[PDB]
Amino acid sequence: TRPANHRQLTFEEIAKSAKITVNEVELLVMKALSVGLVKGSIDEVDKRVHMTWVQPRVLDLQQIKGMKDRLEFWCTDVKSMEMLVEHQAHDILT
Amino acid sequence: AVQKVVVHPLVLLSVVDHFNRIGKVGNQKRVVGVLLGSWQKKVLDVSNSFAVPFDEDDKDDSVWFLDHDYLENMYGMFKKVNARERIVGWYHTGPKLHKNDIAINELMKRYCPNSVLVIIDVKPKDLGLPTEAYISVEEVHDDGTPTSKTFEHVTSEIGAEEAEEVGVEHLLRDIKDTTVGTLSQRITNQVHGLKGLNSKLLDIRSYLEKVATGKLPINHQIIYQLQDVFNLLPDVSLQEFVKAFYLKTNDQMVVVYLASLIRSVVALHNLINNKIANRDAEKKEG
Amino acid sequence: DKKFHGILDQGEGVLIIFDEPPVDKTYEAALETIQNMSKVVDSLYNKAKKLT
Amino acid sequence: ILAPFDNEQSDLVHRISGDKKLEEIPKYKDLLKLFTTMELMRWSTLVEDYGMELRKGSLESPATDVFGSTEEGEKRWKDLKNRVVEHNIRIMAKYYTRITMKRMAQLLDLSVDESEAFLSNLVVNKTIFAKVDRLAGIINFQRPKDPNNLLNDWSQKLNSLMSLVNKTTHLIAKEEMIHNLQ
């Protein structure tokens, strides 16, 4: 659910989202790393976890619209930075 | 199973001339022929080919023909005239992956175990490498059918050889991009390959044409990679990825700053080497 | 004596220990070329500045 | 279990596995299962389930070889303790980034000074790297300075990305040829 900007949740949020105490979520996430459903790292003193990879799920005809529009302005970025190269190095090779 | 394929430019050319020889049919014909080669060291090699007589009618397009006597005797001649050479599989002219190529491969696998196919180009326009090859894998799995079999692309490149490199470099004699210096990389993959990434961004834009309107099978196994690409989209510019980037610019440019400093002194020593040959001949010669 | 490297604290005696081989090869082995090339331009005076 | 850690031990668990007739003992099928898998609950929660079967069965004499000579037993009580106090420290280095000193000693059920003597003789053994503290209790695992590996691992992620965008491209163009060919 979280974006790729942070995806860095805390242990207190799991204590809210799973109503389980603080002294068991570390035992929980070490199981989750062992099975292979998630790939991330665990801090203990700043009480946060750096999740990096999550298991791919399925999605309906609405999340493709998210992959529609997030893909679409990545087209012009490949266009824009290349347009310098065919203009600035044009005489270097015709 | 197979690392990669190696294609010579002869067999690359030895389909085009046959595509000319059947070009007088006008209406429709795909060139399908027998591919010969000798795979060694887990690397697929392709050496020689011909083409077998092959026709196709559009209504009930499951009816193919391979004149196997033409396949028997001419390979028997080719096994005679080159016993190093053998069968390696087959090919077809491959514009758009026609439908009969699901059992053509199964028709003639009783000769080659890994009967590989090769898709070539007759009208060249791309930014990639216009030779494609697949492999035969089968599955009783996933979701689709009890009997399921789909082709998978093993990577492809055009191998050279000391005999034929004499030939092709004599046969080009055309516009060339030799003298690889600071500029060949700028145009082989900095002008070009950035636009090469266009037609792959735009290729997955073409599958995206089914949001509510396109073809009826939806996703299942296409979006696990697309979910990963936005997940494996690289790191943002906040960390020492900012700082260690300025670090190496502050190291790579110092070598350029030394090397350009040398360039000025060398040509200055050349300048005196022309002032030794200017003044010391006008009094001598006149 | 540089047999060990670190730092010593005076208030409570805290030894912050750190290590890195920083870099030596890239710069000073490229720095001495500059003073070699300075002597080459000095030797250009003995065939150009005197001569033409 | 009792052997020191090695690559030879890392497939020794596989050489003893794949045995149809070893798994007839329901206990010892789980014993090697514990050390192929994830974290092991302290030491006390295991000995209440496994420090009692060493009498039972028809199998007691190599366990009597554990039990009988008590100085051989003391070498084998503690080395069995040594492998399981180590089994945490492998994967806590692997899956954590920065843990407190108090938290680790609680998962070992022993003194915080006794925890420091454990991490001392493993990193002068340099088989688990760690940079501990004795003022904030803040230790961390696999934390070098990293001058060059940032952009190096970044360049790795490009090539993994660019190999994947080529995977889908020649997989779409065949998928349009199985619906609208002719």
Add this chain to the structure above:
Amino acid sequence: IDAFRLINANMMVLGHEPRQTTSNLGHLNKPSIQALIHGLNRHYYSITINYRKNELEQKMLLNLHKKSWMEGLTLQDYSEHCKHNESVVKEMLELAKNYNKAVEEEDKMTPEQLAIKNVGKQDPKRHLEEHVDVLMTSNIVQCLAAMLDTVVFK
């Protein structure tokens, strides 16, 4: 290649010169002396040839042979490229020390002599601009290709 065809040795007996040159297109390529030692030109002749070239084929051996896909959108052994930026520069110091040597023995013996004499050992001057091209294109390519992936990839 030089395709041939026979001429009659009966007209060699006649001393009569065949083939009746009616166009300035034959005597363009000169024969080798070694082929002239053999039967040319007493029993056969040479033929000028060329090649039938067409977009049917010429476009599709050029735009099919020397092509690549990723060799340039990728980086190059990032901890070792900067390491290779010392593997050249280190001996480039002492190679410049030879360039801090060889100019100093000028205003001396007539540098046409400084061509024949220096054929046992390597000169600085040509070798000293050799690495400058190498130490440039290895850097300018690798610096530019890294600074596009910052823009394109997020």
Add this chain to the structure above:
Amino acid sequence: LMPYFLLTQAVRTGNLAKFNQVLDQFGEKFQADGTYTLIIRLRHNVIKTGVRMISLSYSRISLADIAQKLQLDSPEDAEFIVAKAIRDGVIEASINHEKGYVQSKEMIDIYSTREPQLAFHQRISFCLDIHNMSVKAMRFP
């Protein structure tokens, strides 16, 4: 040079009326060369040399100590040059006007900043020019 070299001796120092000990000794000499109108304004550059000199040396210095060292005779504008030192941008850090100390932050990694490339890019492009000028001026024969 000796009257004029003694002038820049005062500039590399941080003293204030050392400027006045020159401008009475050689105030007549500067009007012979016709340059006095530029000489008279160096007191802006003496005090910005000094405030860079003191802020880099001392980290947490009282503002009622810097004036006695610069012989400013007044702490009440010793805050104020530091205000124009930050307005011009000589030193960065803050002033505890309630207490009286001027603290300065310690410098950080200037190596991993973009600015040494700006020391390069001026000179990368310059050194390629002189290699080009060595080409353009060579082949007259």
